[PDB]
Nucleic acid binder design. Sequence first.
DNA 1: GTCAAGTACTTACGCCTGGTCATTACTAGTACTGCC
DNA 2: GGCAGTACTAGTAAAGAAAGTACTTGAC
RNA 3: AGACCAGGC
Lengths: 114, 114, 172, 1458, 69
Amino acid sequence: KMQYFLSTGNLVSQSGLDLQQVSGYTVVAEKINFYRFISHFRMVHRGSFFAQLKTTTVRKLLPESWGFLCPVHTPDGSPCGLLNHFAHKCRISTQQSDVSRIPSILYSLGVAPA
Amino acid sequence: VEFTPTNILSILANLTPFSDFNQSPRNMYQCQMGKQTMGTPGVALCHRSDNKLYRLQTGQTPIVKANLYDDYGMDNFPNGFNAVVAVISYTGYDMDDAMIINKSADERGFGYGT
Amino acid sequence: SSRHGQKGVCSRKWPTIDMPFSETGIQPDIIINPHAFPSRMTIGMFVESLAGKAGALHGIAQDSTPWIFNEDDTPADYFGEQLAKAGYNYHGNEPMYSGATGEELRADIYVGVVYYQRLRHMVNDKFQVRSTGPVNSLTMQPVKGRKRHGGIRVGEMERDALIGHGTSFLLQ
Amino acid sequence: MDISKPVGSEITSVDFGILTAKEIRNLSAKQITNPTVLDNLGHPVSGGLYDLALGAFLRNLCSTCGLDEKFCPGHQGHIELPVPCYNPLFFNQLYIYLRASCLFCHHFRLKSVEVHRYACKLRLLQYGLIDESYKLDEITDISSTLLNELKSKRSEYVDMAIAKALSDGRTTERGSFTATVNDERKKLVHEFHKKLLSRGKCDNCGMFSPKFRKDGFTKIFETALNEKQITNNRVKGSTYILSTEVKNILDTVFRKEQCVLQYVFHSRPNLSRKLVKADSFFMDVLVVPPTRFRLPSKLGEEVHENSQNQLLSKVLTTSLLIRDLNDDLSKLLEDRRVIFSRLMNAFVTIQNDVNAFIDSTKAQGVPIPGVKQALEKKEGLFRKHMMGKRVNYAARSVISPDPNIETNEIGVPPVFAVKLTYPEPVTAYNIAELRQAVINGPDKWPGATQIQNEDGSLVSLIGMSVEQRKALANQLLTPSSNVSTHTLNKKVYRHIKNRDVVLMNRQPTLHKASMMGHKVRVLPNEKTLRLHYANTGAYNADFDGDEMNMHFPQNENARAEALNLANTDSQYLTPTSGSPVRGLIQDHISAGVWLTSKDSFFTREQYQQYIYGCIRPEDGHTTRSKIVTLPPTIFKPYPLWTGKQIITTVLLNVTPPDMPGINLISKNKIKNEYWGKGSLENEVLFKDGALLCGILDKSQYGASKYGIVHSLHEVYGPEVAAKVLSVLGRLFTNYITATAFTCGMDDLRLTAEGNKWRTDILKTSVDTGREAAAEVTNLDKDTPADDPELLKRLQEILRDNNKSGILDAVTSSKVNAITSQVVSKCVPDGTMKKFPCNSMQAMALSGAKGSNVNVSQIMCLLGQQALEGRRVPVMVSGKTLPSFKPYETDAMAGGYVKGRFYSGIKPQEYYFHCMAGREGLIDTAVKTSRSGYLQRCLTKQLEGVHVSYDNSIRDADGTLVQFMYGGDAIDITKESHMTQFEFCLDNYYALLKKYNPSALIEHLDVESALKYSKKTLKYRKKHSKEPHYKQSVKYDPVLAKYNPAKYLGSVSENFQDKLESFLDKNSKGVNEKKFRALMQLKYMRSLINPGEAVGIIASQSVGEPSTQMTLNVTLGIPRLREIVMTASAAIKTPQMTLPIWNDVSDEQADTFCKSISKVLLSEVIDKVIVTETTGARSYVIHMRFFDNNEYSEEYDVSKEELQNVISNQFIHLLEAAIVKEIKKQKRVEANNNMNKVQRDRQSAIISHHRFITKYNFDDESGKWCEFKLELAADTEKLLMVNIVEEICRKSIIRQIPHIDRCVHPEPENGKRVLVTEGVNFQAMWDQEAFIDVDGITSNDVAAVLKTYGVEAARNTIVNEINNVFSRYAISVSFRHLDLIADMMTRQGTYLAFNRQGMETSTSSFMKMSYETTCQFLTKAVLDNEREQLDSPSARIVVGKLNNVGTGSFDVLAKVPNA
Amino acid sequence: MIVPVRCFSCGKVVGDKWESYLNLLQEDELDEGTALSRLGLKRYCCRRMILTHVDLIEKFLRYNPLEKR
DNA sequence: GTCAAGTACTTACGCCTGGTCATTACTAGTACTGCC
DNA sequence: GGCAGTACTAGTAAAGAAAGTACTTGAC
RNA sequence: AGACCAGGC
Ligand SMILES: Nc1nc2c(ncn2[C@@H]2O[C@H](COP(=O)(O)CP(=O)(O)OP(=O)(O)O)[C@@H](O)[C@H]2O)c(=O)[nH]1
Ligand SMILES: [Mg+2]
Ligand SMILES: [Zn+2]
Ligand SMILES: [Zn+2]
Ligand SMILES: [Zn+2]
């Protein structure tokens, strides 16, 4: 059932997840090029719900993406503004960082406890 | 302050040379078409069994390249060739978007691929 | 294609004796039109030509990561003074001759090397023929698809484009 | 199709009807009964869905006809549904007659004399008697003595009306049915059904019927008849009802009322005299389709049965369940108690199965698609396989450019030259070349691949050798050894040659010139189609990987059309504007700037090389068989020819001799200042065919009006002008390969003085963003950028959408002034290399490729980067980007970039420029789905509109759209030089050779139309001082009385007025009468031909220039959405233009617009303070206004008028909203003794209104108003501030109805204009003293329809569709706009181009093919509508020749003998 | 992949100059400009063959299916 | 009769080229084997 | 030697972010 | 033949 998810991209869920789309989660890594192959691992997608949608304001290049999303590396046509790629020094957290001493040092900076 | 103003662009966006001299859609087209080239996918092609695979025979490293080119190891994957390009109306066969090759260039193997 | 979005198909593999040739003796193995530049404004390809030719002469590579040049040190001045120290023209030009008539051309032709890219869009993956072939079983109309030896579609927008000429036997 | 296999009969019409069950037991091949499709060992079981009686299946002969798979057509069978079940197509119309009928006397619940009133009105509408059906209402508790007599007078009136009209040559006994009698029939049936359903008691016998409840589909419920009205059932002397009971009711209703439903269910008179039955709404027998049309889904081993077999299996499974449920009723209390509750469960599921077979969305249950959904949408049957089809004999490959092709050809590869083939039947003249074609075989070009024998047999040449193949070449022309085939000859499928024809086609085919007909010239090398550059402007085809289709026609009727009619030489002028689309493009235009320069001198070896390099007399480009030359310009010291004189003798050899040279005075795109002081090279001068002055440019050759090539097209013809582009295409190519053209880095540099200029105007821009900000924020004078009052209000500007819109418009306006100061100085004056040497600048002035704004961004200044009207968007924090500080007033921070593409853009100039680049690609890509559906809606309504032989353009069914095309019946592609009189006078002796006046006097009438053209010109010059309503006209225009294509001199009036104006101002060996007698034959030859598909042209002249827009009034493609597609009476921004009288001044106008512009009670209040006290809920509503010296100056609202709005307008709405909420929750100042008139004013408000117990107003200053408001203790808490706010925004002080604002703009184009923001004509007719009431135009085309009539809305729709192309400077001619107007107003109403504006139409296959197929299908079959196959949509479904153009006439053959 | 015989613009034999170039960069410590001039490569079309050759065949050759590893 | 709003059905650019995956549970049966 | 338990087998049954009109039902 | 994915103009 996990080989079916990867081979098709369909999300079969009895208690549907917090996701709008239900299909199109996996994509063939091409190796048609090495520029193509490394670009699969840096791309972000907004969702296939937003593709079949006749608005424009979700496809915009916002100024909040300074250094997080790339301005130019975005396909032309239908995925324009929706599929886009990270800046090359933008890295994504993947582990819960240490937090347990931060309330212990915020009370000494003047925070009155809740 | 940022470490460098090029950590806002992506992998493919940093490798287009003199990117701040082009118009904005033509930098967006090169990130699309740079990941559609006939380059070298790998070097383990005797051990691969992919159903379709393009391979340009003799790639070259570019004269004009970013410093991020040699840092991601793109010399391991040559995607083109340096070509003596004249910007001339001489032929009559190259007006709208077309272009010509020297005939004896690719009788010698210019841009040959399998 | 180039590395600046200058795509285009090949027209004719032009023979070497018919190509233009410089005073150095070389011949350009790619000709691009100067009319692909003004509407597109890919000035990065003009400066890759200077930087490419000034690097193959001295045996050096030049970094081209963006915003290493200001407005005061233009790369037309940086790569121009490298071409002057090699004995070539400051503006990247070369005196060239015609291959057909053998005459001196008017202006010095702008040359230099840039890095091209061969795209995967060949004609052999395009290019479908059909006189006849297999048809669909439901409608006895030709099959969709190049690999199944099928036909191209004359859709709705092509239909009334045959009405608009007034041609009525082309539509039938 | 074989041309040697004719077919005898023709489908002339179709009509729609319902299969009764008796037909589909006689039609049937075999009733199929078991729900198993095929058993083991793959055999189709006898009696199943796959049976051998229903067709041959999978290498097994049919049991009905005994033929194999290839020759069995397939046979229909049936199943036996045990209960009569609902047909889901007719359930909405069954449920109307299921209701509205009495369950006791079985009439409808109307009175029977009013049901008869529709039966006699609909009988009149079956015939063409739309007028007499309104005279039938003139024929006019109540005894049945006279109602029996009233039905006789209405029926004898119809029998007298029908018999008179059938004898007064008006209506055939088959009945006249047009489009506008389909209007009043659908209008009358919808009046009939709406009045049937609204009944309480049956008005024949007065008692109620229990009402019905439609749960959804598959079920029906009768509701409980109440106890109050069962008494009426006793003084006359919930439950799921079965589908067998509904048929029992409605079989009785349709017999008591047969005489009405013969006319409800028939559009045309029922000649067959059949009954209409209630069985026809149900279905008792399903028709299983033949097994050819439901073959299984075969894919290797993965064999799945068809989706219809899975639906029909469930109907048979349920049909054998219910047969085994009714086997217990023969066995027979509990055995009866449970077996009936499951039998009625089986009644629902067999209905739920017959739903799912027909319609997958009427089936409660990812679902399997039904019969309806194989027809509906894109990927349906009409749109996917009928209006568009995959085709044989057709190619597609990438295109590469090719000169040295004669501009009417396509260059075909060898690999399409071998596969594509053409049937030539053999004759006495083909056996020379077609015997060598068959000998060459299938692989040698020129060759052949198949021989079709006389017998229809077909012999392939593929697997044959050359010795066998020479034997078939001598057998090729032999007499027949069969009598039945004695007049036939063999057809040899030869390869495509250099003489064939080809359709070329690039998608999208937005207009008709994107699908042309080319000749073929094979090329011997590679696999790509090869196109000349003159075709690239029409197909919109660059060479960055474009592939375009190639269709090869297969008979001589289609070869003759694609060479003469859809030819590429005929399509030089597009019919949108009349402007050309064909011309040389990029290198040929920059060469002609250098070749025609004064510097270009050519010696004798060079001069004679350029002429033979382009003429080449053996290919027949010359007209003399010997190249003639000119004497040189300079004789001594040595001969030289100027490059003007190259094109002089180019245009001398390709032109016909003994016809004089062309005379042409035009200009070009390069000014005289770019050449030098005192140059005259701007104007071009051809005199006697000799270029004497000026540069040939894009404006001369190229897609440009009134050039030299466009003037060769008029004087010499379209075949000459296509040849001159071939010669100039080769002359400018060989000049380039000998004298070349280049651009470089050298062409992009400014001087040291030019860069000094640029960096000093750009130092002015460093304070512009603050000066623009301080204007909008209204801070005083020279305020600093970090002023805390400046930073406060800029945050207020940011949070509001419109306040940020006027910051981004004032600041953009000032920085584009700085941009224009750089460009007007630094180029051409500050550029290092200059024209003509500056090649970047030379190809932008010449229009070869580029613009002046492009070299601005390269060499000077990239400019303000603008978003959707605005500047760069701003974050929440006020930063426009993280690099800038929050709310800085810098022009660089808001998108104005100062770098250029030569020197470079900064990293934040780069990022802002990335925003504008993506925005242009989103609007290019995803916003052309709005223009492409504009053109689909246009082309479906206008596909049949065409010129008739009456010179009267009309629809395909026969109804008339206009009386003459554009009012003058002339083609757009011929009226170019019609009013260019000084051109046609200089070229008189050469235009006389192509119109030839004296040779055409014989077949014409010259005497008659010229007399009446002088009796109306002289009459109108005497009149026409008075306006149009005063004109007792007494004389028609000469163009409506005489046929302009037959009578010489029947011209339009402004052609007659402009000819005589030219022929009076400049009086100048041709005299005066020979010139007007040649323009009148040129006008007559510029008439439009009968058969022109005009409505397609008029719909492609809007949808294709709408894609020049992509790829406080609304504008562009959303404006065309409102006018053309929706026809909205609820227009988004209605306006009204009010002309000011010249007597009243501008101070009497802006003090007048305050009386029209509305004033809200919200617009006068500073603040409102409630005071809720409890412990009796007491609300003290204290509402605080502005000063009386403040609101009586802004809005001029007086103090006493403000008191009455509170008294008589505000409180009446406030009290109504409080009672609304109480219902829905059940689930400083002095004393009061100033004067008694305030006590009396208080005492009235307490008396009139509901719960106000105190009221007082500031009667001395108007500043406050305070009224008490009391409630009880039962009521819980109301907000009472959100109540007061939402009532204060609704209460109006001074409102003119439907008008919100009145604005006085600046006077545009001379006349004085006062625009309101709403439409009310009745109220602007009282303001005679200020407004010219005879000039009040408008914007709302549905409101000018309501008050000024049909024709004034027709004029308003043309002007509203004209000025949507005037913002974009797109010229589409007024004849396309005329016909879109006259099609939208053809019923006297304002109909849209959608499925609601096309319901009034005769062609049913047009309506079925467009959208909602099985809703127009049910309306066609419940009308029993016969359609005469008139629309082009209806003739493609059934396969007729189209009625437009070539199929607008027959061809007859004069046989010589009797 | 491997060094091009006979450069793409004029046709000068170039394929014999790859192993000399790596000798003239490692053993004789030269820069790339002097080493292209000593091998006789004067025209800049000839110079950009040996200057920009990747020599990617050495990465291919480490996948030898005909020997144990 | 009546305006009223809620509800229901309806469309949303054209053409072209590749590639993949595609019914699941279960239920009764015949056979395999461990056993005494 | 033959009985019954499992493990399989092949067998046949269930599978949440667009804008327009037309219509009934709905208070009054 | 569908669905999804990746593309071309
Ligand atoms: N009907 C459609 N046509 C399209 C679509 N996408 C692209 N096209 C066609 O492809 C072409 C795309 O042109 P480009 O995006 O390259 C704009 P560009 O600046 O490159 O034009 P040039 O300056 O002439 O090169 C254009 O002619 C369109 O007719 C589409 O979604 N629908
Ligand atoms: Mg293109
Ligand atoms: Zn049969
Ligand atoms: Zn009754
Ligand atoms: Zn070389």
